[PDB]
Every structure is written in C-alpha cells, then in structure tokens.
Amino acid sequence: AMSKLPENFLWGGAVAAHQLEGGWQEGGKGISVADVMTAGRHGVAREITAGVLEGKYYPNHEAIDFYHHYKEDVKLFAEMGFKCFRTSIAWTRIFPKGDEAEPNEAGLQFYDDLFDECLKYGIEPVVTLSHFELPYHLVTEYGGFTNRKVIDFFVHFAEVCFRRYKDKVKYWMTFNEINNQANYQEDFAPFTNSGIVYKEGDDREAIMYQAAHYELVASARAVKIGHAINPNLNIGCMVAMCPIYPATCNPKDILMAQKAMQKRYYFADVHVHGFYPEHIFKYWERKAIKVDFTERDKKDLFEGTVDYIGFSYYMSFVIDAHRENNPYYDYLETEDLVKNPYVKASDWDWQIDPQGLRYALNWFTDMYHLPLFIVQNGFGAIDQVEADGMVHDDYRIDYLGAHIKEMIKAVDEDGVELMGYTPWGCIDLVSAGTGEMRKRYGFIYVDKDDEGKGTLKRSPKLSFNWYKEVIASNGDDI
Amino acid sequence: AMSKLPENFLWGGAVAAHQLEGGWQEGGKGISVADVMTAGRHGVAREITAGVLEGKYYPNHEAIDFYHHYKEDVKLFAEMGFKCFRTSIAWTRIFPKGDEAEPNEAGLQFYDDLFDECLKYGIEPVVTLSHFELPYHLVTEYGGFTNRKVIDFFVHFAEVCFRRYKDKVKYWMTFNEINNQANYQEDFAPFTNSGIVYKEGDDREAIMYQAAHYELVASARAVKIGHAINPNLNIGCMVAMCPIYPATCNPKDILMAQKAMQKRYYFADVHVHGFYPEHIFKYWERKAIKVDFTERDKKDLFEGTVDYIGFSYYMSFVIDAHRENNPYYDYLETEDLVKNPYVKASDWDWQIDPQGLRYALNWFTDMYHLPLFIVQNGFGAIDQVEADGMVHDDYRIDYLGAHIKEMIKAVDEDGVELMGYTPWGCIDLVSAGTGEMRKRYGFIYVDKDDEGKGTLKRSPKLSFNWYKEVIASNGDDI
Ligand SMILES: O=P(O)(O)OC[C@H]1O[C@@H](Oc2ccccc2CO)[C@H](O)[C@@H](O)[C@@H]1O
Ligand SMILES: O=P(O)(O)OC[C@H]1O[C@@H](Oc2ccccc2CO)[C@H](O)[C@@H](O)[C@@H]1O
C-alpha cells in the first residue's frame, strides 16, 4: 500500500541502436538499412538510396555517438532512477552482412559492456532484436524478408544473442512494431520492418503479407529457441498501437474501424494465439494473395507464442466510410483516416490522446489476457534552451504525465497486468520518420542540430528531475 | 460450391415455452415467473404480482395453446423446411416447485413427444434450459438465484433433461440472455433472468452480480455434467448481443463504449474463458460489492466453459459521456445510451441495424474464436390482414433479409464459424417485454388479440414462402 503500481514496476527509457549509437563503421559494423536512409523534415520524406551515395547526408552514421559516450549517458539514466533501459542489439554489429556462420565478437562484447554498465546501476536491460536496422546486404542479396532464407539468418542472430546474454537480459522482444507494415502504400514500413525495396508494378500489399509471415514464423522460432536456452527469459512481441476510432456511430464507420483494427493487429493474434485469424485467409483469397506457408510454419507459430505484449503508443486515429468503391471495407491507412476533432496535436501532426492509451491497454487485456509492457511512449517537440541553460519542456512533462495518469487508472481501476512503462527517446536522438534532431523526445538535451552541428554535450531538461520524481514516488507524484 | 453457407447450416425458428405453450396448469405444471407477469403495452410496464391475483390478465397462461396444437405447428415448420427448431424446456413442467427429488413424468414425456415430432420431419431440436420461466416457488421460498441452494436445483433439472434427451437433442444452451441483467435498474431482467424481487432500499447492482455469479457457476456445472452424460452434446452459452457504439470519436465516448461492452459481456468471458475479467473484481472493490465466491466456484467455472456462443441480435445501441459525476465511466443502460441518428427503428423504438449483426459476429470471433449461433433475430411489428386473407409483411421480409445478407458476408467475407440462424418468434406468440400479441414476429399469423380474443387459427403470412425459399436456396435467394 505504498502506491497504485506494483513495487517492482519497470520505469525506464527507450532508444534503438541505429538511432543513437553512431560509430556505424566501428567494430566492423556492417552497413544497415538505417545507414542508407538520408535525412528529411516534416513533410519531406527520407531518401532510401541504392547504397551509400556521396552528397547525401546520413544522420544515423554519427547520430549522437552513444557508442562512445554510453558510460556517461547511462550514469544520467541511473540518476533519473531507471529500473530498466530499452534498446536494440544492432543486427549489423553481430552479423554485419547477415549470412555469416560466425557472430562478430567486437559486436557482442560491446553489448556485454552496455548491459554490464546498466547492471552496475541496478538497471535492467530490455532488448529488441530487430529495430529498423537489418543488414543492407540482406536486402540486396536476398531481397530482405521476402526470402524464406532470411528466417534462418534472423533465428541464427537471435540464438547467438540469447545464449550470450542469457544471464544478463531478462526482457526481450523480437520485431519492433512488426505491424507498421500494414501500411504498405508508402515505402517506410516495408523497408524498415522487412527490408523491402519495391520495384515499379509490384503487388505491394501482397509482397508485405508474405514478408510479415516470414517474420512471424521467425519470431516464433526464436521464442522457442530462447526458452530452451533459458526458460526464465521473458520474450514478448512488439506492436505499434494506434487505436482506430469510428468517426461516428454510423454503422459503416463502426465496420470500417473494426475491419481496420483486424488488419492492423492480426500480427498480435498470430504472436499471441499462434494462428492466423480466418478473416486474413478469406481476404488473401479475395485478392488472390498467395503466401508460401508450410505445414511446418503452422507448427512453429502455434509453438512460439509470446510471453507478453510490448507496444508503443503515441496517438490514436479516426476512420470513416467516406472513400468510394470500397464495399469490402478494405483498409487504406493512407486514405481512410480522418482528423479527430476533439484533440490537440504535435507540430508533426501526431494527435495527443492520453485516454487512448487506456483504451489500448483494455483492448489488449480483453483480447489476449497477457502481461503488457508500454515500451515506447513520448512527445516529439522543438526545444528552446532557456537563459539558465536548461530546456523548460513543460509541454513534454504535460504529455507524459497525462499518459502516466491514464496508464495508472488502467492498472488501478481496470486491473490490466502492466510490467512497466518506458518513455521513448529518453535522450535526444535521430528520429525514425524524418531523421531529424530537432524533433526531440529526450529528458536529456543533446547539442546537435539537423545540419550536423554541435558539441554533442549532454544537458538535462526540466523534465529530467520531474521524471526522476515520478519514479521515486512510483507514480504517486506526477 | 452450391452456396455461400455450409451445406448443413442450421436454419430454424425460435420460441420459448412460456411464450407459446399455454396449458400453464396442464400436467401439474408448477406456476412460474412468467405466470405472474401481467400484460402491458409499448410504454406501459408489465406488473409482477405477488402470486396470481384476480382481475389481472396473465397472457402466458393460454398464450397460443401450442401445448395442444404442436402437431399442427410443427407441420407448418417442416413446411418451411426448418433444419432446426429452438425452444426451452419449461422448468415448471419438470420440477413444478423446484426443490423436488423427482422430476415430473408428465412434463418429460411431453418434451419426448415434442422432440419426436420435430425429428419425424428431419428437424433438430435446439433446447434452452432456462428462458425466463423458473418456478415462482423458488422465488418466494429461496429468493431465486440469490440463494446458493438454487444452483443445485438448476443442475438437478439440467441433468435430468440431459439424461432424458441425450439421444434426441444435439444442441443445448443453459441460461437465456444471461447478461440482460446488466440492466439492474428496471425490474424485468433481474426478475426473468434470476428470479429477483427487489425490496425497497436494496443494493440492486450488488444483488444482481451475486445472482449472475451463481448462474454462471450453475451453467458451468451443467456443462460438465452434460458432457459426462454424452460427450457429443453441444452445450453453449446464450447472450443478448446489443453492440454498443461510441456516439463520436471523442475519446470519452470511446471509453464509455468499451467500458459498457465490458460490463455487458463479462458474462461471455466467464462462459468462454472460465474466469472473471480483472476489471470486474476491481469494480466490485470500488463499490464494496461482496460476492460469495468459493475456491470451488473458481474450479467449476474454469472446468465448465461452453462449446459455442448462442446469442440474440435485434439492435444496436449508442453511448456517450454526457452524464455528469461519472469519472469512473460506470455504465447505466437506462441513462448513458442515446439514439443512433443514422438508422430507422420499429414502432417499439427498437433500432434497425443489420450491419451490427456483422459487427457482433466479428466481435465474438475476435474475442473468443468459438463457433457461434444466431439463435434469435427478428422484427416485431403490427400485422394487418390483407383482403386475400394473408398478412403481406414485406417489412418483416426486409428486416430479416438485410440481416441474413450481413450474416452471409460475415461467413463468406470474414470467415466466422456460424452454426446456423434461427429467426425469433417464427410463429406469433406472447412478447416478453410487454406481453403483447400485437407485437408479432411470426411467419405464421395466429388469430389472438391482446384482449384475449380470436380463434387461435394459424395462417401463413407472406414471409412464410419467402423464408421457405431462403432455406431451400441455402441463402442464395433472398
Ligand atoms: O518521431 P519518430 O522518431 O518519427 O517516431 C518515434 C519513434 O516511434 C516509433 O514508431 C514510429 C516511428 C515513426 C512514425 C510513427 C511511429 C509510431 O507508430 C519507432 O519505432 C521509433 O524507432 C521512433 O523513433
Ligand atoms: O419483442 P419482445 O418479445 O419484447 O422481445 C423479443 C424476444 O427477444 C428476447 O430478448 C429481449 C426481450 C425483451 C426486450 C429486449 C430483448 C432483446 O435484448 C427474449 O429473450 C425473448 O424471450 C423475447 O420474446
């Protein structure tokens, strides 16, 4: 009876290798998909270049040089009182090309040192095996996850990590936001989830269902392998959770929303229940989508269901039936969505809806009854440095706080099993969508701009002590 | 490849004993809760009288005398080509008082004859064990299902039926629309689901959670007993399914709807998963609701989950956050609901929303992945007899047809497991809500009015042959 959350609640901070590490060549790090994505801005898309071209600016190359400053940054984290720290093991640091019979020792010891650093301070590593950073070689030589071969490659990588870190890392996830690729219209998700370069004329949708299937099977094989290595390992899936509201109580909107939820979260059904929902098979029929799906796959999936559901939450969506010629209620994320009139939004147009997080949490609970883990939540905004040399980011404090409250009501009032809560980008890093430094998520300001300038000096923002106090009060004082 | 539904799809018609049988005293039939409910009209409520008073009119007493005319009526059913016929075994015909050590033979042979009649014609009986007709004695002497004793009484009744009809009836359900009592404000549901007479000052909500719990346990014990008697028996639950839409995409409405769905369908969670959702326990805490819930209950529930979900569908609801002083998002079915602007409605104000049936079907599938059975759907309307001596009820044909189409899209496009489809009140009978004859559901017109007059002659309506043809085309020709 100290607070409303469990005593061992896992407060932390989350990042991803390719977004902060830098030293993209150190250790012999192979070149990854992140490494061939140039910078952009709100509105302007990143360019996926055919290799590393001259004249282009690749922000992930240096990022914030975490690769060298990790001892300092971790000290900062422990100073806020992190109980956990989430990041990914850069696939490119362990298998630079991807097809190697042997893992890279420089890559492994590096993470041995990183986890060691966390553990010194009482911080529990939370590790994501694939986070938008697969070997670019795998893309050009195999076509990414459209090749069944790439499954073994991933499982190979996963077992190595599992065996190496079996006594260090308790919490794992396989594929970051695996369901992002439900949007197959734009190139981003297909490229970052699955290493898909689309060629002109391709059946984009179809190519992505097949890749997702391979990854689902790969995830399931890893889960089984990881448990055989250490049965205590908690291995969860990871889905991006953008709840999808019906615009109105018009039955057509209702059906749009339900159908879109099914297409956006069938991935979770497979991770959790171990089989595909029928509405996916029916749909593949209607669209003559052919999937290479063996009896063996079926067995693997059913056998490799997850321990818990990790997920990100930043916003919610609205949908309606406005689009013509759509009698099957297909879901086009680039077309069917509309703005929610009842909510504010960030300068990147990301809608602010704390209550949605509560909705999300109840949803997963009712659907699956598994432990849940908010492993990404946060607010991207422009920071100005006040005269006292500190960013007074109360806007960021507001966002996170409102979300923390809703998450607490979910545990306290609603009874969801929640493992912990991990704010995204706890230190300023390179954004995923645009490759911007100026879209900052951090409790820690890093002096680097989008033209690549700055000392890379770390300074705490206002929200640093605020959050330090949230952790200390285990949620009582927000 | 004959049609869109499975060859063995179970088309039928549904009724309930107390609503058509009559002969409420024949066989020594004990007096039931139906038997003490007087008539009413749209707007005017039925009176639950303390016993059978003089001067009051009890329509269920005679109803349509099905008890005598069943041989004729079944012939009518077979003429439409029913593959199944659904009704309830009148608890009062088997255990008139309820507490007897021995079942009533007159009551049993009666149903032996009724099922025999169906089977002659190739019709499969579908039986509901409790449908708003428990012994009134059980109410006055035990307080209905607020007494833990009444569990055994029900299980006793269920095993008798199971053993008697083990080779005759393949499809069973335990408690009709068990979740109706989520509305504990008005007296109807608590009285008809659970035999609850509220006394002034009572904690209505609390008294109903306890009764529901007893019934849930009773259902679970019966399921287990029935399987031990014949492992082939399909024993499903039965829930009233009124989908609950958010009025708008305002997050508050969203949360209202989700919370209301949880309170209205936790019954299904218990039937299906075998345990209570945590949000129910949390809620009982907040409201200091105490439930007598033993370790043994827990074991029974987990052990007595259902084979399939039977359900009724007539309409959908809309909800919003308008009501003040409601920061916990409690659900009051008498207060929180609003009209759906995008749909028409019957003269009893029941909203017409076929698409909702599709929503319903997808909902259950996604939540539970069990076979489903639409065992009640229909349209109550005033019938006028045309000059040719037939009711031209195209309004009724319209309603059912639209619903059949949506149900077919669900199977065909969405891939739900649906066992069959059973229109409600396939022959005109006494309505549940108001006790009216004039609120007609039938393919078969019965000449009896609400003042009790008429020859009780049966005549087919326009919709008779229409439906006969739906069955023959197995859904192709609607
Ligand atoms: O603001 P950024 O940097 O564009 O995103 C934030 C973070 O959210 C995660 O998910 C997203 C990434 C991009 C767009 C949307 C989402 C949310 O569904 C992503 O997995 C992270 O890698 C990313 O950095
Ligand atoms: O039109 P009536 O006769 O008032 O109802 C129709 C039928 O629907 C069933 O459910 C209902 C009964 C009454 C009100 C609403 C519902 C639907 O949720 C009931 O279980 C039947 O016994 C009943 O006859």
Residue numbers in the entry:
A (entry chain A), B (entry chain A): 0 to 477
Sentences from the study reporting this entry:
Specifically, the β-­glycosidic bond of 6′-P-β-glucoside is cleaved by 6-P-β-glucosidase (6PβGlu; EC 3.2.1.86), releasing 6-P-β-glucose (BG6; glycon), an important cellular precursor, and the remaining portion of the given substrate (aglycon). Here, the high-resolution crystal structures of GH1 6-P-β-glucosidases from Lactobacillus plantarum (LpPbg1) and Streptococcus mutans (SmBgl) and their complexes with ligands are reported. The GH1-family enzymes utilize a double-displacement mechanism of catalysis with retention of configuration at the anomeric C atom of the glycon moiety.
For a mutated variant of the S. mutans enzyme (E375Q), the structure of a 6′-P-salicin complex has also been determined. The E375Q SmBgl–PSC crystals belonged to the tetragonal system, with one protein molecule present in the asymmetric unit of the P41212 unit cell. In the E375 QSmBgl–PSC structure the aromatic moiety of PSC occupies the aglycon site. An analogous set of interactions links the anion (or a phosphoryl group) in SmBgl (E375Q SmBgl–PSC), with the exception of Ser432, which is substituted by Gly432, resulting in the elimination of one hydrogen bond. Interestingly, the active-site E375Q SmBgl mutant also showed some residual catalytic activity (0.8% of the wild-type enzyme activity detected for gentiobiose).
